[PDB]
Design a binder for this molecule. Structure first.
Ligand SMILES: Nc1ncnc2c1ncn2[C@@H]1O[C@H](COP(=O)(O)OP(=O)(O)NP(=O)(O)O)[C@@H](O)[C@H]1O
Ligand SMILES: Nc1ncnc2c1ncn2[C@@H]1O[C@H](COP(=O)(O)OP(=O)(O)NP(=O)(O)O)[C@@H](O)[C@H]1O
Ligand SMILES: [Mg+2]
Ligand SMILES: [Mg+2]
Ligand SMILES: [Mg+2]
Ligand SMILES: [Mg+2]
Lengths: 263, 263
């Protein structure tokens, strides 16, 4: 009777053995489905996230549009079912970036990876991109998340050392300090758990709900954040920009890093 | 202004470093608050769980009542704020059982442990217990949870080899096969993740939202389930019952194991 997945989807997933992904960092439900020939992945988001960058439907649209443009998983099945948005996809090719690195430190290799991602993204034609994740679009949804108590679970935002007394004060800041934008393909959440590597080169991208048109400093800022909190040495933030062949815009960088605090 | 915690509580935890719990296999948000001299814990549940065995307020009431009866964390602060039930507590004394016996091949000691918890519980006077978790009560809230899509849909249930085809079929079974109850003190979720041992003796119980009056076979059944999950040696189940000094009632043991499937 009442279920989160349709009988057809259940039929498609029956031959597989399920293993709920143990991470917990977003509202989405991620399940690894192990089979005798391959593994599939089922990602799901509830009604409260409809139309937001968290919505797997939006993620599915981007995943379909990115085929032949970026190495991304194949869309096997998508559905809207009893409030839920369900996506069945293929497993990404290669090794997860966070694994290839882990303890075996190869700093330069990570920076090169991030640089490779940025250049690759800039070569992508966005003339027919299904989504425009402009600051106005992001702020509008952030307002929605705050009004409905759906914004990121405050744990760090409770500390005294927080620059903004509350989410709204941070929101107001982002709304007033909104910088100019130059739309380019944007991943939306460039990080070590969303990138896959094979033979030193990017082999795949996942977590595409926040992907679409956005300013180029958005992803760049994320790389900076990743480099600083994953590697450690600020010298690799220097190498990062050397590889890109540009000078860092710290004002725009600090802003985008701030924009992601509430998500 | 809009916050999940009150100004008072925010002030009470400023000197602590918040680190969100990795398990998160429930609706409740758990945060380890790292201080210089000690660690505190903050558990919180949203309004959709109000009045259920998940509601941390219900957990607070049982934590206060259990003081002096069972080794439990101290209630430092509680409050209902914007629909959120918030509980600030002290760190449990001793070592987590899933760590004291972490990969440590000593399955007999964890049995002795469970046997002791059961013995402890049967010594607790329940005459003035705050909650009665009778099957009527449990099935009533389960009904509410299923209707509102708040129950736990263990992804493993989507396998082609599973017993019940959907949540309601299992519910109808639980509603029809309801055994006879003899009330005693029940933890509600007796497992290696909610028990602490210090010197070969239970030093702390946590996760008390499901605590109250219930049939004795409930906690005992949970012990059987965990015993079987650790090792495929049914011999240890016999040992457990030798320690308890009773003949196992399989119809009730099976019944309670199934009841926990949707929670
Ligand atoms: N198609 C896939 N191929 C391989 N691994 C996958 C795939 N989908 C998900 N995963 C794995 O599961 C994790 C979580 O999936 P993800 O799509 O990032 O969910 P999420 O909650 O949006 N993640 P985040 O927001 O980064 O916490 C990823 O880091 C991978 O480890
Ligand atoms: N007072 C405490 N002292 C020590 N550790 C604690 C305390 N409260 C929570 N924890 C830790 O955090 C984990 C989750 O807390 P718990 O109260 O079990 O939340 P939960 O989501 O109800 N858990 P479960 O339903 O078992 O998944 C516990 O297994 C402990 O590791
Ligand atoms: Mg991700
Ligand atoms: Mg994500
Ligand atoms: Mg627990
Ligand atoms: Mg629990």
């Amino acid at each position: 009777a009442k279920m989160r997945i349709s009988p057809e989807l259940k039929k498609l997933i029956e031959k597989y053995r399920c293993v709920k992904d143990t991470e917990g960092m977003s509202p989405a439900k991620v399940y690894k489905l192990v089979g005798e020939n391959e593994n599939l992945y089922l990602k799901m988001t509830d009604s409260r996230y409809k139309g937001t960058t968290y919505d797997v439907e939006r993620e599915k649209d981007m995943m379909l549009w990115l085929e032949g443009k970026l190495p991304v998983p194949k869309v096997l099945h998508f559905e809207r079912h009893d409030g839920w948005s369900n996506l069945l996809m293929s497993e990404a090719d290669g090794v997860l970036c966070s694994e290839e690195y882990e303890d075996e430190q190869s700093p330069e290799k990570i920076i090169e990876l991030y640089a490779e991602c940025i250049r690759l993204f800039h070569s992508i034609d966005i003339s027919d991109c299904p989504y425009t994740n402009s600051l106005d679009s992001r702020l509008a949804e952030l307002d929605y998340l705050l009004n409905n108590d759906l914004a990121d679970v405050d744990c760090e935002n409770w500390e005294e050392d927080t620059p903004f007394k509350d989410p709204r004060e941070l929101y107001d800041f982002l709304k007033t300090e909104k910088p100019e934008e130059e739309l380019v393909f944007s991943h939306g959440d460039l990080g070590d758990s969303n990138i896959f590597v094979k033979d030193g080169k990017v082999s795949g991208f996942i977590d595409l709900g926040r992907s679409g048109r956005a300013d180029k400093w958005y992803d760049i800022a994320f790389c900076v954040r990743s480099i600083r909190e994953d590697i450690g040495e600020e010298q690799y933030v220097e190498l990062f920009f050397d590889l890109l062949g540009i000078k860092p815009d710290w004002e725009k960088i600090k802003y985008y890093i701030l924009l992601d605090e509430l998500f």
